[PDB]
Amino acid sequence: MSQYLKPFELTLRCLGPVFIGSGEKRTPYVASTSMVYFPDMERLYADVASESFEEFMMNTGKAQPDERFNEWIAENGVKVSPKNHGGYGVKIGSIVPGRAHQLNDIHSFIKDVLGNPYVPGSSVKGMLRSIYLQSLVHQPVRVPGHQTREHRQYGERFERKELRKSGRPNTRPQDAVNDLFQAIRVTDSPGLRTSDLLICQKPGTSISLRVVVDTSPTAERFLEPIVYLGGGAGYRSKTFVLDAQFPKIKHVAMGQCELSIRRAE
């Protein structure tokens, strides 16, 4: 290796499910009792030599989702099944449901090119962005302000105070160049099998990752824990010490992971 730089690793085992949004949505899928059939859309236009329901794919109106999109098409001469049409599926757990406030359209995790998912490297770099500034403030600084412009702003003006100390004689500290948090180098996780994410209304998967600590731009203690990030993670897991900004009355009175130091190589 080099003298300013060593490799490092870390544990990442999730216990609750992991959902990172990516601006992608699934829409009428089969919402039935035992099968959620996610098929290949490329194969439904191979009997043209067709037009059973692929004219009604456009056609929707003032109707409720998951009414008739799956109880009509298989009763024709279509011969739809797994291993004969193809595709994949993540299946339902316990509830059907029948709650009041059925199962609506479902969000999307990030996948690589084939539906094979991964935890993002940017989030697991942003996970530790919620750690090293966040931990050792223990007076402990607050988030003082009445309006939404000055509720959360102390995550900004404190992030450039004791975190940008590379200290070149010709650049300011409080910008993109003089950071010391650019020491370790996160590598994004590889692609896994299909059924790892499960349907949630808001599980023991092994993920490893390479991080490479560096002491090049600095002119060893950086490396030195059951925090929850990767999905629905709450209101106090993003920064240090989110109800007052939205109008909610009670301000006046599922992603479990694990991290521990591991110096393997």
Partner: protein, 120 residues
Amino acid sequence: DDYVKQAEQVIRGLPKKNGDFELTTTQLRVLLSLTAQLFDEAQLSSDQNLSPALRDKVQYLRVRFVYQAGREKAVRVFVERAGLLDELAQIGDSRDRLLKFCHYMEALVAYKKFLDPKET
């Protein structure tokens, strides 16, 4: 052939109800980035009339627009105004329409961004 002038007015046929847009450019990156990929090799074929290996390849671009039309109501009126799925029927005849269609399609992004801020 003058459909670049058509994109000046068919963007104003978007139903903009708040005063603001509702079909912003951000929803379209699963549309406009996938028509570029067939375009780059469509020109690369020296033959005017296509091969059957190239007639079937536009069909995935067709059904993803009807997947988006079933997904979002904004795309459903985006198609049937400018007649995308209408021109995507005879696009399996020859590439000259397929060239003119994406040429039309590139013009649809233009006045859309002309009225959008686009600060990064």
